[PDB]
């Protein structure tokens, strides 16, 4: 809307190279940012045991 | 018959097993009539 | 506000064909405990009402 | 087991056969799922709810 | 309708589609983080209980 | 995909392939049971016989497996799914989904335990991470 038709053609040639230089300076890692998954889970065995309960656990076990 | 039978029994027409047909899709208001025939005697 | 995966699970169930019959109406579980009710040979299960 | 289906048929002759769902974690250490495939769900003298 | 103007539009579609997939990945990672956090809260109410 | 699997010309050529490789396998096995006894020094003549037997085993299984009906292949793929999803489960479920069909055909002592419930199962995309590592790994043997 501001440049005359002569200035805007030169500016358009400038702008196409500007897009392609932003193509180069962007990279394409992908991959590692795509194979990470929502895989989180809680596991554990916590028990409150009396010493005589530990006596009975060892009788069953070794 | 209608659309219901002529689509499912004519596009397939009893054929089957390897055919697979393709995809399915002043000058305000007066109640007087402004007469088309411009004879004043036409009504 | 939150997308819900809802932690889909490892539900392991046993579809037991439980054959109950001629049940006596009984209150909550604390009195239907085997060692304190002692059903007859006709009645064969205990309906926990409340 | 064919032994289990024969004993179940003899026990329930004039009763319903309701279909209950049993959670695998609600079972105690006695009724391990390895043990269920060999003898079935053993109900003790206290009794188990369905 | 230049080749650079509709190579611009191809790059609009590629990045915008990848934004849709990444926004769902933030949602699934956030849902899983407070999934395990709920397992912590239930473990606190159960072990202290 | 439905065109190719249901194409009759290729299907009955697969069946005629199965008939001809089975007769090839039977003849190589029958001819290898007995040697040839004449009056000459003879080499092994055995490494070519067993090479045609392995040729008539690999090629039979390529035809017979590629000629699988789609409902059958769907049931096999779902069986591998319940094998894959079982790994984040109980000890009995893990063994039973990987077949193992052997089993199935003063003293009030204070103890308690709190358990992490084994109902975790990470999201649906981890489900495909299961399957694409059973089918696209390098083969262990032949």
TrEMBL record, chain A:
Signal peptide positions (record): none
Protein name, per record: Zinc finger protein
Source organism (scientific name): Toxoplasma gondii
TrEMBL record, chain B:
Superkingdom, taxonomy of origin: Eukaryota
The protein, known as: Uncharacterized protein
Organism: Toxoplasma gondii (strain ATCC 50611 / Me49)
Shown chain mapped onto the complete sequence: 124 to 261 of 1822
From TrEMBL, chain E:
Name used for this protein in its record: B-box zinc finger domain-containing protein
Naturally occurring in which organism (per UniProt): Toxoplasma gondii (strain ATCC 50611 / Me49)
Automatic annotation (TrEMBL), chain F:
Superkingdom of the organism of origin: Eukaryota
Coiled-coil residues: none
Protein name: Clu domain-containing protein
Provenance organism: Toxoplasma gondii (strain ATCC 50611 / Me49)
Span covered, complete protein: 4441 to 4647 of 4956
């Amino acid at each position: 809307t501001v440049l005359p038709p002569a200035d805007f053609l030169h500016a358009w040639l400038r702008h196409c190279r500007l897009r392609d230089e932003l193509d180069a300076l962007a990279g394409d890692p992908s991959m590692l940012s795509r194979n990470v998954f929502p895989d989180m889970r809680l596991q554990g065995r916590v028990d409150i045991l009396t010493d005589s309960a530990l006596r009975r656990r060892d009788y069953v076990a070794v | 018959i209608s659309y219901e039978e002529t689509k499912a029994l004519a596009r397939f027409k009893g054929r089957g097993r390897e055919y697979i047909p393709p995809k399915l899709t002043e000058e305000t208001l007066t109640l007087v009539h402004h007469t088309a025939s411009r004879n004043p005697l036409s009504p | 506000s939150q997308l819900l995966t809802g932690e889909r699970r490892i539900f392991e169930y046993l579809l037991c064909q439980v054959g109950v019959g001629r049940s006596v109406v009984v209150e909550d579980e604390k009195e239907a405990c085997g060692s304190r009710f002692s059903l007859l040979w006709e009645y064969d299960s205990a309906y926990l009402e409340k | 087991t064919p032994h289990l289906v024969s004993a179940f048929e003899r026990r329930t002759q004039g009763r319903l056969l309701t279909y209950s769902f049993v959670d695998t974690a609600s079972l105690d250490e006695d009724n391990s799922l390895q043990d269920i495939a060999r003898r079935g769900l053993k109900i003790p003298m206290t009794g188990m709810r369905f | 309708s230049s080749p650079s103007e509709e190579a611009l539009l191809e790059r609009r579609r590629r990045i915008d589609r990848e934004l849709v997939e990444k926004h769902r990945q933030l949602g699934q990672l956030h849902s899983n983080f407070l999934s395990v956090q709920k397992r912590i809260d239930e473990a606190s109410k159960n072990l202290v209980g | 995909v439905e065109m190719v699997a249901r194409d009759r010309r290729r299907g009955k050529s697969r069946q005629s392939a199965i008939k001809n490789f089975t007769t090839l396998f039977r003849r190589v096995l029958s001819g290898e049971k007995y040697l040839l006894v004449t009056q000459a020094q003879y080499q092994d003549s055995r490494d070519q016989g067993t090479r045609r037997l392995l040729a008539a085993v690999k090629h039979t299984l390529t035809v017979k497996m590629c000629d699988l009906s789609l409902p059958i292949q769907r049931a096999v793929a779902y069986r591998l799914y319940v094998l894959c999803v079982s790994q984040s489960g109980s000890s009995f479920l893990r063994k039973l989904a990987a077949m193992d069909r052997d089993g199935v055909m003063d003293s009030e002592i204070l103890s308690t335990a709190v358990k992490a419930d084994p109902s975790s199962l990470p999201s649906r995309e981890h489900g495909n991470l299961m399957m694409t590592l059973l089918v696209f790994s390098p083969p262990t043997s032949d």
